[PDB]
Design a protein around this nucleic acid. Structure first.
Ligand SMILES: [K+]
Ligand SMILES: [K+]
Ligand SMILES: [K+]
Ligand SMILES: [K+]
Ligand SMILES: [K+]
Ligand SMILES: [K+]
Ligand SMILES: [K+]
Ligand SMILES: [K+]
Ligand SMILES: [K+]
Ligand SMILES: [K+]
Ligand SMILES: [Mg+2]
Ligand SMILES: [Mg+2]
Ligand SMILES: [Mg+2]
Ligand SMILES: [Mg+2]
Ligand SMILES: [Mg+2]
Ligand SMILES: [Mg+2]
Ligand SMILES: [Mg+2]
Ligand SMILES: [Mg+2]
Ligand SMILES: [Mg+2]
Ligand SMILES: [Mg+2]
Ligand SMILES: [Mg+2]
Ligand SMILES: [Mg+2]
Ligand SMILES: [Mg+2]
Ligand code: NA
Lengths: 178, 158, 186
RNA sequence: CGACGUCGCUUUUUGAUCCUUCGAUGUCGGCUCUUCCUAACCUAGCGCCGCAGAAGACGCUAAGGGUUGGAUUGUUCACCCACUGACAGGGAACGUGAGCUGGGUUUAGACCGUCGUGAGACAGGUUGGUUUUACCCUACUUAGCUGGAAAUUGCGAGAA
RNA sequence: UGCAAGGCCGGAAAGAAAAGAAUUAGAGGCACCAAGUGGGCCUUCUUCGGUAAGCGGAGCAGGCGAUGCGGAAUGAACCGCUUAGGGAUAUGUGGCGUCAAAACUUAUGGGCUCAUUCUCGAUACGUGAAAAGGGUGUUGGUGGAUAAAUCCACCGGCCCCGAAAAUGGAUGACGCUUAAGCCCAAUUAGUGAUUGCCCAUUAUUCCUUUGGUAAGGGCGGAAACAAAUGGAGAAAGUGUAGCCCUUCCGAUGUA
RNA sequence: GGCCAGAACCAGCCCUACUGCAUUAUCCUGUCGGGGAUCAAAAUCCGGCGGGCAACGAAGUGCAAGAAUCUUGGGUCUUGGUGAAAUGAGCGGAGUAUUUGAGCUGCGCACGGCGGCCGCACGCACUGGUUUCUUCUCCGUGAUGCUCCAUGUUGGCGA
């Protein structure tokens, strides 16, 4: 399945005024389901970092960043999440994926599964494609083997939806109720 | 328990500000109040003679009668399903001239001046343009907005 | 998860290991042993030319991986039992009352344990041979012999567990039947 | 086993509250009789002990079984005598009054003490003082009759 | 000739510019005569007394009372939506293993979890069941250390221990564990874009009724026209079988 | 026949098909240098440098207005009809055209570099030109009808 998060580059600034005739222009990296959430995250970051509110600023661009050609790569994702008891916890993880958006979506799913963290309590600090020899975790390093192979065992193979049946003869493919 | 006298619950209301104590000044005495004027009724705690009730502190109205040492003001007060026009009598030290119609009077005078200029043929001032229009932005410096590792350490005390 | 985890064992020349549906059978001199490991769900291979037994776990966590070494140890135990067998020597230790042990064919009877009048009877399976060493060599010694380690033991334990001191101090009253030496028969 | 600190649980205790009931839900104890709970007294296993033995302490799984006779008191309690392997703790509208009993409480008679000018009052003592109704419906316990697989019908067809 | 007041006579009027520069299912006022009320109770936040209480007392605003309907199994007041009487089509809250409509148990999604007698868990509100403390259960982080990878402290996640009551019993019943549990994410799946499906007294629309602070037309018989063998009616009108036609909007309700 | 059922067509709805414009560059290539891993490689990875459309079933990114007429989609036992005033891009007459998009272009002007010159993706005016392919366009019927009712087809059933 394609990733549920998209790579957005949000470029914006504060609205020029008499105190600030030439405001600084900020570029922002976000992974969001849509550009509305992308702009919301951009303005949250501008408010909590540069003391600029969305009501006193404007957005020069909210474009998407196209993914590179699909290649099996190792992606280092530096990410952070908030919990009430633990405060802010920052971690760095390695993922095997074909795209930056895919790796970041995998990271979001992993954080939700293992730490019960939702999208709005997670800040992605960085995502980058690292070489094979810089991978630290063995769970990711095990896919660097030049001759890597394995059989598919314990596979629940379902029939095509048009050919699925309720009652099938015991040792034949004949369907009794379908 | 709680009583219901004329000056109940006015400990911070009828109190002078910090390092602003004192009886009213000469410019308060020399101010001219006319019938039909708008005035704010702010009680001066140092006078204590002719002070309004605690309700009328901060309300503005139109003076309806002028008296040697007093002023009568018509203040709107909502009771139940309607607002009454209560005519309160205070001393002149507890009223200030109101600037509520300042912008309206300035707008009227600006319109008259503009009409005079148009009649005389003088060039009118340039019209303002909205800041909500589009345009090409040439940035002096472009920065990267991102969350860094040091931010969490900075926000974490001790 | 770990994509591949292996455990490799070397098969001696005399013994042959055969695996079919997670059912291992080791056949050599001195007998044949069989183990049912259908509860484990591992990948068991035997290379006859290289005389190797491999057990593999694909995409396994720590709990599934822990069974690789257990399977390897089980197969090694069956190989060792088929080759040299297993011999457990138990000894009757007592302070005051002699513990009289009589061994018939596959039958053990223990009497006068702590002066009790109750007779303790144990039936040994035909796959395990029980004998009594004559007192001239070593006093009150019973020897269990067999190919299966799990069967030679258990018998030595049902004998230890039946002679247990009850309602008394166990720091004192140290008498019982204790396994002293575990070894082979060939 | 354990300060002084700290977190629980319980509803066999009192309190708090006033939601139900004032054209009425019989109010204490006992007796009888069943059942349930476990936070286990005895009884079956089993750990540990400052556990030699004997006798115990502490814990574990377990509620299958059992848990008494009396003196004083209306008592619940309490206390004492005695037997026992042991004489555990409780719940069931503070189980159980058309089951009983009515000793207590709580009318009207009367006496005392204290209080009241009195009539009278006491959460003080004392004595005497109507316990109604099932033939109804369930529920239990026994006792009969009798249809029914489309659980009355379809002709609707399935044999361990 | 200055002020203050009551007039009168002129003048000018973006009838309020431009700068983000209001909006309105905005007829304003003004009487008269009456009825039921005058035990209230529930929340979200704020709040006082009390160890607390399904306890007592306030503030603001909503809601029950007075009111159904769809959903949380069940519940005054929670969630959705508020009610003429019928259809179609959409939704909302809530769901799609069976009960029970809907994934005939969806994916060509990702992880996590195994729980032996109140029997893991799965519905907010509703501690309408639980902590302090612990776990060498498993799987994630963070900072060290050492060198074939180790081990040391420290934080998550789910599970387990803590965790005892009286009729037999309640995720909802069954059951589920390549979940039918938990966290996240899809909508037919790296194929080529942006609505899977099922349920309301809700929305949209259609038909009919009823009532308007209702809105309009027509109403000087238009000419003709027997039967045997196109027709009828047409009222200047509050209310009728409503004078007729067209149009729009509303319709629940205790006292 | 004022009954039952089926097919036709109308009108109005309600569903579906059929898609263009703009974006991309942290991208796409090639080639050098590193770096990596191998038996040797290659690749993941990082720098230069030269190109450039990953290319319309490219992208799951913004917005889409594409006459279900061409080109007999479906539905309406969820509406009313059978022409008792059919208002139609739909009928009925004419005509082979018409303008309106896309190309490609003219001049001035905006606009963008850089300080009057250069650019201009083709905005604005001349409703500029061209016609290379893309579309059909133009006329027509009051009520002398105030209101309501009254007009198919094919079976089955009713003689
Ligand atoms: K009684
Ligand atoms: K007296
Ligand atoms: K008395
Ligand atoms: K008595
Ligand atoms: K008496
Ligand atoms: K309601
Ligand atoms: K899954
Ligand atoms: K009407
Ligand atoms: K009338
Ligand atoms: K039909
Ligand atoms: Mg009664
Ligand atoms: Mg009764
Ligand atoms: Mg019992
Ligand atoms: Mg009782
Ligand atoms: Mg009774
Ligand atoms: Mg009685
Ligand atoms: Mg009596
Ligand atoms: Mg039958
Ligand atoms: Mg009353
Ligand atoms: Mg529907
Ligand atoms: Mg179903
Ligand atoms: Mg009428
Ligand atoms: Mg009504
Ligand atoms: Na003040």
């Amino acid at each position: 399945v394609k990733p549920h998060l998209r790579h957005y580059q949000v470029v914006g600034r504060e609205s020029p005024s008499e105190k600030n005739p030439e405001p600084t222009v900020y570029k922002f990296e976000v992974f969001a389901p849509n550009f509305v959430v992308a702009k919301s995250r951009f303005w949250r970051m501008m408010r909590v970092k540069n003391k600029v509110k969305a009501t006193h600023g404007d957005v020069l661009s909210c474009k998407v960043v196209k993914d590179a050609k699909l290649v099996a790569r190792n992606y280092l994702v530096d990410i952070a999440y908030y919990s009430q008891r633990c405060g802010y916890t920052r971690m760095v993880k390695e993922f095997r994926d074909v795209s930056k958006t895919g790796a970041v979506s995998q990271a979001y799913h992993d954080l939700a599964s293992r730490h019960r963290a939702r999208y709005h309590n997670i800040e992605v600090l960085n995502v980058k494609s690292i070489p094979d020899h810089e991978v630290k975790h063995l769970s990711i390093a095990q896919y660097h083997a030049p001759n890597l192979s394995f059989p598919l065992l314990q596979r629940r193979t379902k029939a095509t939806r048009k050919d699925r049946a309720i009652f099938v003869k015991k040792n034949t493919k004949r369907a009794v109720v379908a | 328990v709680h009583s219901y006298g004329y000056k109940s619950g006015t400990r911070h209301l009828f109190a002078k500000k910090f390092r602003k104590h004192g009886v009213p000044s000469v410019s308060t005495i020399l101010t001219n109040i006319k019938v039909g004027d708008y005035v704010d009724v702010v009680a001066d705690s140092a006078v204590r003679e002719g002070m309004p009730h605690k309700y009328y502190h901060g309300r503005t109205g139109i003076v309806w009668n002028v008296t040697p040492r007093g002023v009568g003001v018509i203040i709107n007060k909502p009771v139940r399903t309607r607002t009454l026009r209560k005519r309160i009598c205070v001393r002149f030290e507890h009223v200030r001239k109101s600037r509520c119609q300042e912008a309206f009077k300035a707008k009227e005078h600006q319109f008259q001046a503009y009409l005079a200029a148009k009649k005389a043929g003088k060039a009118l001032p340039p019209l303002q343009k909205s800041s909500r229009l589009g345009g090409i932005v040439r940035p002096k410096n472009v920065e990267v907005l991102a969350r860094r590792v040091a931010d969490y350490e900075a926000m974490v005390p001790y | 998860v770990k994509v591949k985890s292996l455990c490799t064992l070397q098969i001696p020349e005399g013994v042959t290991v055969d695996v079919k549906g997670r059912k291992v059978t080791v056949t050599g001199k001195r007998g044949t042993l069989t183990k049912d490991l259908t509860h484990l769900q591992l990948d068991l291979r035997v290379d006859k030319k290289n005389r190797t037994f491999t057990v593999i776990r694909w995409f396994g966590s720590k709990i599934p991986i822990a069974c690789l070494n257990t399977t390897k140890a089980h197969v090694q135990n069956m190989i060792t039992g088929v080759t040299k067998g297993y011999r457990f020597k138990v000894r009757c230790a007592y302070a005051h009352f002699p513990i009289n042990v009589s061994v018939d064919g596959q039958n053990i009877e223990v009497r006068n344990f702590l002066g009790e009048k109750r007779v303790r009877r144990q039936l040994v399976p035909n796959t395990v041979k029980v004998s009594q060493t004559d007192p001239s060599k070593v006093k009150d010694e019973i020897v269990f012999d067999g190919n299966d380690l799990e069967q030679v033991s258990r018998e030595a334990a049902v004998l230890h567990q039946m002679c247990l001191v009850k309602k008394k101090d166990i720091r004192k009253f140290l008498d019982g039947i204790y396994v002293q030496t575990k070894t082979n028969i060939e």
